[PDB]
Each structure stands twice: as C-alpha cells, then as structure tokens.
C-alpha cells in the first residue's frame, strides 16, 4: 500500500471485477451534471480470494 500502483490496481480491480459476489460497500457523493450532488454507492471486492479470466 506504499505505492501509487496500489491505488491504480485497486481502482482497476473495482472496475473490472466481472460479476464478483464478494464485494464491500464504499459511500461517496457524486456531483451530477445538473448541478446538485447525490449519494453514490460503489462496490469494491471485499477481502478474500477472487478469480478473474
């Protein structure tokens, strides 16, 4: 976790996770193009062993 590569790889894993069913939640605010901001629910794979293709 001491390298920015960790952040980049974590983001790429969160995006490309196929249909992984061992995720964990992550709450954030997304500013819509309309001008207001609403809650954004993003799922990151929870700790464990996951398989990709």
């Amino acid at each position: 976790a001491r390298d920015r590569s960790y952040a980049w790889l974590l983001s790429w894993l969160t995006r490309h996770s196929t249909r992984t069913q061992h995720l964990s939640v992550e709450t954030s605010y997304l500013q819509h193009e309309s001008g207001r901001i609403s809650t954004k629910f993003e799922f990151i794979p929870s700790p464990g062993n996951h398989f990709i293709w």
Binding site: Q31, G35, R36, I37
Partner: protein, 53 residues
C-alpha cells in the same frame, strides 16, 4: 465543494478580517439589531394572542 451553504454569526463584525467576508465567500451580510416599534408590536401580539392591537 459546490452545493454548500455556510452560515456565520458574530457579535463584533469589526473583528472580522475583510478577506474573510467578501462577495463570494459571504454573499449576504445582515445586521440583526435591537428592537423596533413594529418588532415590539409583533412580539406582544404573538406572546398574548387575542388582545386588541
């Protein structure tokens, strides 16, 4: 962050640095002073409902 409303209050406005309160950091400054005749009338009417004006 956008979509944010900030309310600031003070009792000595002269003690606020002008850079802190400028048109874009504080868009509206209002002076809430002592009572006026109409204000006293309204307070009396609200505290004692039913009495003659």
């Amino acid at each position: 962050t956008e979509a944010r409303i900030v309310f600031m209050t003070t009792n000595y406005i002269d003690r606020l640095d002008p850079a802190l309160i400028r048109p874009g950091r504080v868009d509206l400054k209002e002076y809430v002073g002592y009572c006026s005749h109409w204000q006293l009338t309204q307070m009396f009417q609200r505290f004692y409902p039913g009495q003659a004006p």
